[PDB]
């Protein structure tokens, strides 16, 4: 629901956002890891 409880989530989002902006959110998944996350 538009802007949930507290503003923690709000900050969390931009936090994670900055990770991917600088290259801290980059990752690599193996076949096994892809099966558990994507399901296929």
């Amino acid at each position: 629901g538009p802007h949930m409880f507290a503003n923690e989530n709000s900050q969390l989002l931009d936090f994670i956002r900055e990770l991917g902006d600088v290259g801290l959110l980059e990752y690599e998944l193996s076949q096994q890891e892809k099966d558990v996350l994507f399901g296929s």
Partner: protein, 95 residues
Amino acid sequence: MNKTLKTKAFDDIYQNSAELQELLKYNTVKFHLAKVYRILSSTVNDGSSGKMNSDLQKELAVNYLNTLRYGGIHYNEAIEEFCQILLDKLNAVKK
């Protein structure tokens, strides 16, 4: 040894939370966080986000974390702790 954050207020936590950084090493964590990063950048692969819309992206982003936090559907222990530890310092910086 890796990159640093863009906001110093946020960078503070990222440097001052080893328990947060250990979680972020897990590809399962890293993966689920990438899911939401797509959202804050765009709601669609056409474009979106010109001079607004980002406040709306906030909602769609939270929509994801709501399923990742305590009592979600595909919630993860490292994601649960990730948000807890993160927001912990975010609330502990508020004077």
